[PDB]
Structures are given as C-alpha cells and as structure tokens.
From a paper:
Schlafen 11 (SLFN11) is an interferon-inducible antiviral restriction factor with tRNA endoribonuclease and DNA binding functions. It is recruited to stalled replication forks in response to replication stress and inhibits replication of certain viruses such as the human immunodeficiency virus 1 (HIV-1) by modulating the tRNA pool. SLFN11 consists of an N-terminal endonuclease domain (residues 1–353), termed Slfn core domain, followed by a linker domain (residues 354–576) and a C-terminal domain with homology to superfamily I (SF I) DNA/RNA helicases (residues 577–901). SLFN11 forms a homodimer with the helicase domains adopting an autoinhibited conformation.
We found that SLFN11 binds single-strand DNA (ssDNA) with high affinity but does not bind to double-strand DNA (dsDNA). To structurally analyse the interaction between SLFN11 and ssDNA, we solved the cryo-EM structure of SLFN11 bound to 60 nt ssDNA at 3.16 Å resolution. The overall fold is similar to the structure of the apoenzyme dimer. Both protomers bind a stretch of five nucleotides via a positively charged patch between the helicase N- and C-lobes. Since the helicase domains of the two protomers are rotated by 180° relative to each other, the ssDNA strands are pointing in opposing 5’ to 3’ directions. The majority of the interactions are located along the phosphate backbone (helicase N-lobe: N633, Q634, T650, K652, T653, R656, R674; helicase C-lobe: S853, R855, R856). A single charge reversal mutation (K652D) abolishes the ssDNA binding completely. The shape of the ssDNA binding groove in SLFN11 seems to sterically prevent dsDNA binding. The sigmoid shape of the fluorescence anisotropy data suggests cooperative binding of ssDNA, consistent with the observation that both DNA binding sites are occupied in the cryo-EM structure. The opposite 5’ to 3’ direction of the two bound ssDNAs suggests that the SLFN11 dimer could simultaneously bind to both single strands at a stalled replication fork and may thereby block fork progression.
Author numbering:
A (entry chain A), B (entry chain B): 7 to 158, 188 to 353, 381 to 519, 530 to 899
The structure:
Amino acid sequence: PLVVEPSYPDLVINVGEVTLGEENRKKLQKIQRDQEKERVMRAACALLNSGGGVIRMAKKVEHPVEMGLDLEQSLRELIQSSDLQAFFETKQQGRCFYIFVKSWSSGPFPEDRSVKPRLCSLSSSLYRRSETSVRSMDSREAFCFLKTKRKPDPADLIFQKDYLEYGEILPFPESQLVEFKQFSTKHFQEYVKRTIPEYVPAFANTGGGYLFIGVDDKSREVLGCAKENVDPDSLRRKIEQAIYKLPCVHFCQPQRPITFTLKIVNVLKRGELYGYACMIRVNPFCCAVFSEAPNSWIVEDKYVCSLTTEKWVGMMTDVYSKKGLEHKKELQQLLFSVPPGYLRYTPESLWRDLISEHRGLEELINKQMQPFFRGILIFSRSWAVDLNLQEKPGVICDALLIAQNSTPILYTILREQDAEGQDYCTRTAFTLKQKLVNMGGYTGKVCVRAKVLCLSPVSPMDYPASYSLAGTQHMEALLQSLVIVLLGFRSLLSDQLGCEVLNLLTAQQYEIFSRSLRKNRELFVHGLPGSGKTIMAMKIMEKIRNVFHCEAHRILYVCENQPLRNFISDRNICRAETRKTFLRENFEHIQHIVIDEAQNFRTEDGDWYGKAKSITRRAKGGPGILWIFLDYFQTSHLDCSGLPPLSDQYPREELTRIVRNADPIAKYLQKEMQVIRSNPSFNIPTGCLEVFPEAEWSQGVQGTLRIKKYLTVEQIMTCVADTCRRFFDRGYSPKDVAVLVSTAKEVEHYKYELLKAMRKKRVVQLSDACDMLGDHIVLDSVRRFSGLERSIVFGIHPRTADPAILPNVLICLASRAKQHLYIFPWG
Amino acid sequence: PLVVEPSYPDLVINVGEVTLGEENRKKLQKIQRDQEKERVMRAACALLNSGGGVIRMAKKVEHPVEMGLDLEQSLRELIQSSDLQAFFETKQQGRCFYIFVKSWSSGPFPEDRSVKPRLCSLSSSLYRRSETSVRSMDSREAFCFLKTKRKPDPADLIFQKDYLEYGEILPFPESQLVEFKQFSTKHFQEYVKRTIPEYVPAFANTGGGYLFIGVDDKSREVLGCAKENVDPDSLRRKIEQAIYKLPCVHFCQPQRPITFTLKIVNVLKRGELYGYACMIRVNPFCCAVFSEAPNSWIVEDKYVCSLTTEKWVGMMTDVYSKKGLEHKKELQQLLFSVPPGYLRYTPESLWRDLISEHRGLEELINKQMQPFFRGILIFSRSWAVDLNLQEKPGVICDALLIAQNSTPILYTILREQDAEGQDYCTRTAFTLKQKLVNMGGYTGKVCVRAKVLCLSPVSPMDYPASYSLAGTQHMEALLQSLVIVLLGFRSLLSDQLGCEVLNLLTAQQYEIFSRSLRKNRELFVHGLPGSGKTIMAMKIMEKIRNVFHCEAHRILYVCENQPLRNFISDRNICRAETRKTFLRENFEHIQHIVIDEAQNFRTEDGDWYGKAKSITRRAKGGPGILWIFLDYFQTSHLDCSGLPPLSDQYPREELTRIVRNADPIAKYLQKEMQVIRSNPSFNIPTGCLEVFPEAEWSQGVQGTLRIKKYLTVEQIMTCVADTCRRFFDRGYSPKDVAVLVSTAKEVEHYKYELLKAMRKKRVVQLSDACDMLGDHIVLDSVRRFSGLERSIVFGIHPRTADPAILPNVLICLASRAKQHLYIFPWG
DNA sequence: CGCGT
DNA sequence: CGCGT
Ligand SMILES: [Mg+2]
Ligand SMILES: [Mg+2]
Ligand SMILES: [Zn+2]
Ligand SMILES: [Zn+2]
C-alpha cells in the first residue's frame, strides 16, 4: 500500500522501485511491467484527485532515462489528453525520479463545473454496447452518461423457441442488440461466470439486448454445449447470481433491481438431445450498472484509499465564501496589490509592532529579502492559528512570501532554535498549499516552501521551473485564491477582507439607488437598519454636486446629532448642520437639502419640515432636491418627529437589503426587527413597520455577536479590556473599537471605570464620538453615535425610560457594529 | 468523387460498392480495405458537418451483415465517443446498405458553442510533442489548443559543437525537447524530407525542441551518414524548403514565419572525416502549425468538398433572429401548441379560405389525415415562396404535418397532376429540413417526407424508428425550431410570430415599469413614440384594481380622442372619458385618475390639470393615483396643453425602449425624432426633446416600410387596393389594415375613392376608428387614430397647416404601424 | 424623555 | 388650428 510520507510541505507518495526507460521496460516480464505501471498510476491518480503532489520512485540506474512509452500512454489516458506537460513534469537526481502532479480539478465551484468531470480514474467500470463491440466509458463519457441518467426485433423469434436444432443458422447478425458467444465444455461454468460482467452491464446501460450463449459467432449456427456436463438447474443459479452481484447505482425511485429473462433450451441433433443453449434477454436499466467498483483513488489522511461505487458516482455528478469568489479580483487589488519594483510588507501596522517588540527582527527579515525585489510579504503573528491549526509558543511571527521568479515561501521566525520549529512550518505550509487548491480554487502549479528562521544567532525538494511565479499574471491569480482562502477563517486579514466586501455590497446597492436622482426632486427614503442609509446620503450628496454642478456650500445636510455632523463636515461634501442649528440660522443661499435620521427629529424647536420645503421650493431650479432619509425601526424617542403623515410621504424609495453588517449581526437585526413589528411604539405611523428586507439575502461576510449577562460592572469592564487586548495583539488598531453606553450622562461613570481596568493593557486613552479621526477607542452614548459605525462595538447596559423604546435601542446599537458586537444587558 | 444524388428530400451520398462484415473485410487486401473505409468516412464526415443525411452503399451479398470492426472504430474516432447509436443508425434492404447520419453541431448559436467543436474531422493534422512521442490532436484537443493560441538545457551544449566524434554518447535522453533519428544513406534525401513534417510541427506547437539527425536512438551515439553521399549545401536546401512548405495559421500580428536554426557538422572517426550530422533547433511558434491541410469534408452545392486550412481554422474557432431564439418556447405555445387528442389545423383563417375556393379539398385532406390523431397541420398557400424559393403555378397549398408517431411530412396539393409536382415538393422538403438544422438549431434526428396530392381524380426511403416523433417532448422541440426558422423569412406565420415577439418585449418592459406603483402616487410618465405607453396604461389600470382593490368605476381614464375612449371602454378595465366629457360631468366617486396623450390636451374647455388634482387629492386614501402619460414628440397642436411646467412635472418615469414597432419602422421613428430635436415647436418646453432612446436596442422583429411619392390619387389608391389584395390572398385578415388620412374632413373624399378602386378586389366595406372589433379596414384621420395601432398602415398625403407640426404628424402616423407601413406624401 | 444648547 | 361637440 502507498503511504504519503509526511516530512514534506506537499503530498509526496513513495511508490518504491520502478524500472524506467523503454528499453529496460521491454526486457521485463509482462506481469512485472504491469504491476509497476499500475502502482505508478495509482499514485498519479491519487495525486490528481487530491490537489496535486510529487510521486517519488527510486530508479535502478544512475544515468538519465526516459519514463517509457507505456507509462506515458497510461498518463495520457488518465488525463484524457496528449497535453501531458500541463499536469505532469519529471525531474531526476541520482537514483531518484520525481513526477510532479498538478491537480485535476481545483476548487469547490470550478469554472468548468458542468463541463469537465471532477475525478480522474484509471477506469470507470462503465461499459456500453457500441454496435458489435463492448466499449468502456472514459471519465468524460461516464460524466455525460451519468448526467443524462440523472435527468428526470427478429432476434425475439429465436428467443421464444423452446428447442433449437443443431447447426441451425440464425438469420440476424451480431448487432447493437445481439451477441453470439461460443460455449466450451472444458470451462463452461467458468466461461459463463466471466461472460456476464462484460455483456450484461453493456446491454443494460444502452437499450437492452439479447445474449446468445451456445451460438457460433462466425457461422451463426447453434451448437450449445455437451449435455453430460451442463446441469440446467445449476447453470441458471450461477448465471442469476452473477447478474445480481453486479453493482448498480440509482438516481430515481423506485429502485427495482436489474431485469432479465433467462431461458435454457435443449439443442437437438437428428431429433436427439445433444446439449443446452443459453439465451439472456436483458431489459434496459433505469440507471447506471457497473461491472465492478470504479478504479479511482484519493488521498485521505496519510494513506491512499480507493473510492467506493457510491462515493465515485456522487462525487462525479455533484467555510466557502460566495461573495469572496465573485469579488476576488476587486478584493485582491484593494489589499494584495503587487507593486512593481519593490517588495511590499503587509500589514504595515502589524509589521511596525513586530520590529518594535523584538530587537534585530527588522535586520533578519531585510537580509533574507535581499534576493527578491518584487512581490508582497504577508505577515501574521501565527499563520497556523489563522488557518485553524494549533499555535506554537516560541514563534515570533509567520511571513508568506509571494514574489516574482520565486515559489511561494512560508517563513517562520523563532525566538530560539527548536527541533519542532521545522515541523511546525512544514505542517502550516502544507495546510496553506492545500487550501489554495481545495478552497481558493487555484488551477495552476503551486508549491509552498517551508522555511524557518531563528532570531537568536530531509532536504528541500527542487521543483521544476514551471512552479516559480513568472510575473504579474501568476502572482495575481495566486493572490486572488489567497483572498478566497482567508475569507473562510477568522483572522485579521480575513476581517480586513470582510470589511471590504461590505463596502463592495453597498456600492452595488448604491448604483441601483442612485438612478432616482433624475426621477425625483422631493423623495422620502425609508431605509432599514444596516441598509447603508447614511452611506447613500454621502454618496448622493457627491452626485448632486456632479449632476447639478452646484458648489459644496449649496448643499445642506441636516442631522439630529453632533458627532455625525462633524463626521460629514470633515468629508467636505457639503455644509452640515444640526436640526437646532438649521432652525436658528438663515440658509438663503442653499439650493438642495438632504435630511438624515429624520425619524429622530423633534418639533419642540420649530417646524423644520415646512422650513425645508420653503428653502428648496424657492430655489433657482424650481423645486430643488429635498430628500429625507429615515428609518422608523431606529426611533429613539416618543415625541413628534415633525414628518408629514405617512400618506403624504411620497414619492418613496426603500433600502431593504442589509449590506452594512456581517452575517451574525445582520441575522440579529432581523430578529429584533420582528419584535418591534409585533409591538410598535404608539408614535410611529401604522404602516411604517410592514417594510420587510429582501426575501433571501446574505452578505457572505462572517462576524461575531456575543451576549454576556448578569456580569457586574467590574466583570463587564474586565471582559471589555481583555477582549480589546486580544484584538490589539493580533494587529487590530484602536480606531476599530467603540464602547457604547445607554446615556451620555452615564459616559462619565464608565469612562473612569474603563481607564481603571484597561490601563493594565498599556493604553490609557479614550475619545468621544465627536472625534472619529483620532486613533483611540471611542466611548459615548448609543444615541450620540447614530450615523457612525465601528468594526468592533461593545454595548454596556442598554437601558431606557420606556420599554416600548427598548427594542429600538438594541437595533440602533446592534446596527453600529460592522463585524464584532458584544452586548452586556441588565440582569 | 462523391456526389449528392438529388432525387431525395435529404442529403444522400452514394459511396458505391463497399465490402461489409468483418469476416469479409479481413479477407481483403489492406489497400482495398483502407480505400473503402476512407470513402465511407469521407461521406460520414461530410454528412456530420452538413446537417446530416444518408450514406448509400451497395453491398455484395444478400443476407444481413454487420458493418465491421474497422468501420465502427473509425466512426467512433470521428465522433470521439462510443455513443455510436446517437449519431449513426443502419438499415439494409436487399443489396443496399444505409447509414443515417445525424448532424454534429446544429444551429448558428448552439448551447455548446464554447464547449464542443463545430466540425468533425478525419484528422486535424495538428501534432504536438507528448514527452518522448509525437501525437495528433483530435477535434476537441485541437479546439482547445486553438482557443488558447487565440487568446492575446543540456541539449544545447551539443548543438554549439562544430564537430562530433563518431560513437560519442550523448548524456541526455529523448524527452520533451530532444528527438534522436537514425540516418541511412540509402534514402537519406527521402528520409529527411519525410521526417520534417512530423517532428518540426510537433516541436513548434509545444515549447520548441531539438531534432538530432544522425544519432542512434538506442545507444545515443553519434553516427551520421556516409560522407560521399551527403551534399552539405544541397542537404540544407532540402531541409529548409521542407520546413517553409509547412502550412501555418496566425492569430496575431506580426506574422513572421517559423523560426529554426539548422547546423550541419562533420562526424569525425579516428580524427578523420566520416560523415555529416543534422541538428535542428525549432523555436516555439506564436500560432498553430499544420503538417498538412486538415482532413475535414463538407457538402457544398451537390458535391462533397474539402475544407481548406484557413476555412477549417476559422470555422473551428468561430437572417438569424436573436429574439426568436430566446423566446422560442413562449412563441411556440402561443401559435404551435400541440393539442392532445385531435389534429389541429393552422392557420384556421387560411384553412377556411382554401376549402371555400376549391371543391373537395376538405375531403382530400381529411381522408389523408385519418391515420394520425394528434399533432398540428400547418397550412400555407405556398411553402416554397415562404422559404424564399420560387413559386410553382398550379399548386393549391402546402401543408406541413407534424404528428405524433410520424416523421414530419410536407404535403403539396396540386389542382392537376404534373411531373414537376414531385420535384417541387422534394426541393421544398429538403429546404425545410436543412433550415430546421442550420437555422432553427434542431439537435435531434429529423427527416421531412415529401408527398404530393392531386385534387383532380424513386422510392420513399424508410428511416429508422428513431426519426419518428415519439411524443410531446419531441414535437415541442421540433416546433420551437420551426419558430426560429419562420422568423428568418417574410411570410404570414413569420408575421404572426413577429407580432407576438413585440407583445413579449412590451411585457418585459412593463414589469420594470410596474414597480413604480408602490413608489409613486402622482407621476409624469414621459414615453417615446413606439415605447408602448398606451399599453402600459391599460396594464397599470388593471394593476391599480388588483393592488388597491378598487372597483372598475373607481378608476377614471381620460383621453383626448373618441376612438381611443371606446377601445378602452370595451376592455372593461375602468371608466373611460374624453377630456371634454371630463371637464363637464361630475366625478365625485372617482379615486384614481389616469391621463393619456396629455400633450394633446387643450385649455380651451377648462383647467383639467387642476380638476384632476382636486378629485384625486380629496380621495379616501390620501393623494390617490394621478398618473399622466404623455409624449412630447407626438404634439399634434400648437395651443397650450394645460400641463404644469416642465420643472413641476415630477416625479418622472421615462419609457425609452421602442418595443411596439418592427425594425424598419423603429429605425424610421428615431430618424424623424432627430429632426424635431433640431427644430422643436415653440409650444413644447425646452427640456422635453432631449430624451433619448436606449443606447443600443433592436426588437429583432422584421417589417416593411415603403414610401411612394409623386403618385396621383388614383395611382396611390390603386397601390393601396393592390397591396391589400396581395396581403389578403396570403391569408391576412382585413382587421390588420388601416388607411390613415391627414384630416377627418378629408376622410369622406378618400372613402369614396377607395370603395371605387377596392371594389374590384371583392371587398366594398370600410369602418371608422370608433369601431375596432369589426373585421373591416379602418379608414380615418391620423389624429383620430392616436392610441390605437394596426399591423398594416397606409398613410395617404400627410399634411398640416404648419410645417413645424409636420414632423410630428409622420411620427404620430408611423408609430401606428406595428410591422408594415406605406406612406404617400405630397409631391 | 434625550441631545444640542 | 383639429376633434368632440
Ligand atoms: Mg460476439
Ligand atoms: Mg525517437
Ligand atoms: Zn432507478
Ligand atoms: Zn502568430
């Protein structure tokens, strides 16, 4: 049995000793030649079906030799093409011969999923009748055959006869439905046992047919067998068992077995009994019949194991990120852009942190990177824990080098030398290489060299020149597969990719929404929580500038809260004012007005809606743009908002797709949205809450939502400090964290508590929501943080004076967290 | 040479006499066996590449025989599968043997266009190096190879040597880049000439390589040739010409020829000259190199002709209706629905006309249709003229029978027997069978039996049972291909299909537009001419009924003209009133108001727009639906329309895609729309005319637009009568014709003129636009016909009091004609 | 009631 | 001016 040898960052199969060179292979016996060829092809098929690898054979000579014609031909038949160079390449050193096998079909959703089969096989064991011959279906033919099976005669006149005359010539020839077999008494029991698996499956798979045993092929005459040797009762039993032993696979109900009719008749010579003849009428089968189990191999664990009949068929016919696959090119250019001329280090924030803690790490890496002047070096504190492997204490970092004219290399830096250091890097490099194929769907020839560096002051296999990254096109296609691989796990770069997917989803939803600028002047946009409402408002206000050619100070943005006002002002899109400022100052020079979070406005200061109409309707271009963005699910107050009644809020646009939160967060919003629908607040108009999200919609971005309850303030605030430290250690920056409390008067109570326990984590800095550019944790109230959002949000004791609003607070809070959310409610 | 014999409604190739049966083929000489096999395969390839047919061979025996193993194997290699039954079927009668060949790839846009090749070939003549052997690319391999080509070493150390020692053993073996050939002096000039076409193309197509001539394969030793026989100067010339004569096909610029380096060296034995050796370094080629012309055949005219190198490659890599292809299933169920239980006759209107003119035609057809009780019988006065063939005088009709458990049959009925009658039906049946494959893209096995019937009181080839229509699934797929075939020609059924495509395009544009009912209450829909504006209004008014659950009398439709009012009233969608009626009567009970052709309204009677707002804004559901459909391109008057100014006409929807007129009509509307944009009328607001149609849009529906000028009234009115008679003879009904004059006062002048000239055409009946259900030609004014449309429209002397409106009249007139338009302007 | 005052 | 009157 072939066993994969584990000292390598790849699948290496040692097939032992194999004779090579056609001259040397010819001199061998047929059995030995066939055994060596079959072992090599078992290895090659196993590597083709398992992501690729290396086949290791030890040759019996020193001088260079060719592989041999039979080995080449079997490989060609295996990949069903003469393009042998694409999948196989050979190198030899001394007494060792290497065959480097590429993967046959790579990825969970290949671009050729419905065209080419996923498995290579030595033989599919599916035969069919092809006029007067029985032929086996190759992998492509068997693939199409199973695909069609999956979708939802003068010869009988002889069959009805109860006896046959010796030497009777049958009129019909051999054809698609008739086969004549000659029956010899010396091996008659053995002959009929071997005949059945070749012809009965061949007939059943294509239209049925008749099998005449005891009829001469050449002259079509009835001969039969010796009567003294054949037992008519025993002969039927052997035939019946040989048919019922054939493996068959059903795609339908019912699952009746193979149907046939067996008739045994006397052969008459001069009116006297001479012997017996066999006729088999095989009705067509509803599904596929195999003569035996398919001969296909796969590498599972460290062994090479064969695929069973059911697993072969199922795999032949039939975390993975759907969004990462379609946006793989857009994501790669955002993060893993390859710079022409210099070697880029990413992530830069984590690289700076590493060289600060460890002395001489900057010189160690820089000296090692001297050979290569183009590519990207991707850092991580532990690439093993990023790929869901176990973390090794004593490792400083891991760096994955993807450079031009170089194979991918995984660098592991150790503080002190260790014997386990090389095993750890080999296991991680092997895991990364398999993910790039089985998960990221890389169709090229990929290898990952495992290298270990020690900060304190088995041979590497030499791959062909085709495994090196030739240029920009190879590095880009490799990195786009790394994008898909990263998105399947929880890590820092996975979370950076996840955020950029959410910005890609919103930019798609904006192009649909942005078409309403030509069609409307006054509009009431009724967005759902996490629908990207505020992001569209900023994008629209840029569009209004571009379409109507008005200057920035001509567009007015009005919001209820101050932190959101400052955030908009810093973008320099337009003039941004609060509602109170809007009702006080004079705005004669304004042409267009955009209002956001209008459901949180109040009438206590003045009639803002009438004022908004007056400024816009007296503009130069007739009725100017007066768009009101609002979300009744996020109603934080019980007073009158000042909006016109629901029947007057026309025309309308509705943002229903949640494109701004990760999957666990988005699923949480919908759950809380249903609660308010059952018990809406009295102030909200009746028809507001019947707006529903998209029928089926998922962002394909994974996140975290955890709720911790009955903890006291010290226990809550410790978990906040501990969790931030773990995030900060992995490389996250403080500007991705926010701690939201219920009320602004409660900020000062908790700000002292946070600094008390979070000072132990070597940072004593906090910021308010009015400052969003500072690289500090933002602590403020939930209501004051509306319009803004952070990757990581901590919600501490959500509370309100009226439980009718309490569902609205959690939705307002939960929607603020793009990916990670931690809530600590009252207990 | 094989010639297609033309007495058949199919491609029949007579390959002469062929020996059949493996026992009989073995006894033959190799040359004779190869010649017979190659002739049969030329025929089979020609039929596979040319839509299918029958291969006719005369066998040398009477009793049934099999085809033979070599013939079967060559057919399998031809179709690259053991599924031999799908494409080939065999029947034999007496001394004649039939092979029925299905088409390889059928259709101009097959469902497998980028997957499977379009050509079957005996050999592609494309070789490549596969490790230590040269292999030919089959059709699939060559297809993929050309697809990739289309997209935008220790061996050198011996090559640099200027001389070689006799018996020197080369270290490297034969491999992907090195080939060792032994050179014999007896045929050295002949050997090198034959060697080049096999190996030089093999190297050039895959990565280049080295060709050593004069080196022993087995022992790798340098031997060379005899020095007295080889001429070094002559030897280079023969090698160079043998390389430059290789055909090559380029997909790129530039087109530099094949690049190679030839070195001839002295072979030294014991320090003395022994002979010469040849080394060739072949650089990889930018494109494909053929060893010789590809061996693929096609049937052109009546001959079987071979494909050249350029035509083979071009066809290998690379009127047809796009709309008919995508809507082929929807169109088929509309017209050619297969009825279960009875044999349907279509078109029913033409069938009734035929049995009236000709006595006993009903009994002739009914007696003939007794055998078959399911299917459809498709009539036409001449199927030949429908397929752009020549019409035969003396034929009464043609009927195409598509029935269950029957091959398609084309019936031709003759008034009197004729010798040309069978030739005419055979030519038409052959033409129809080829169109269903080359144009309609039928992938099944299809035959069309040509039958002739005589009203006044060569053998049919027997096809296999697989050519009969098994059931509903086969008949539907055959008819859907007939739908695509019909749409490529001008005929009655082609025009019925064309109209139903226009109704399919409008129903697509409506689903996009119908989403604006939830988003708007008041809306101003600015439609383009031929955009389907009135059709959406009727569809919306049904939607308003369904969505708001209001009754029909609660919805009010207001239009300027009377005939459109009656047409809407007869639909029972709602209450429909004219503008004058709207301003007079009281409409207190109305909830929603829909206004169409608002640009043609006038203020002389009263302020309709203010009245429309008052009724809708005081409705029960707040501001009820008040949608105004309008089209400023169709402004027929110079007064004030009463609409609010262009800046107040918000929100807006715009119907820009022309989905209501055929291609020649639609192209005419855009040409006239551009004229008004250059010189708009003074009454139209400035920003109205800058609305543009879809950037690129074509209906895929063909029609007719003809302009006849300087004709006198009698000359004009004769062409109207003559053209109607020709249309009516083909089976068109009078309710598809309209004659539109400039002014309603001018109707009475022309109505007498038409009845004077059209009475010769056996119809003396006309109708006004107020009656649209009567089966009579509608004659009325252009303005009075607004909102309605007819398949065939005659426009006689378009005139107006102001030339600023004159472009608007032609657009208003032209948009009335769905498919056929005839205009007779002033001269 | 909460936040901008 | 044209059509519904
Ligand atoms: Mg046999
Ligand atoms: Mg050789
Ligand atoms: Zn079954
Ligand atoms: Zn080229």
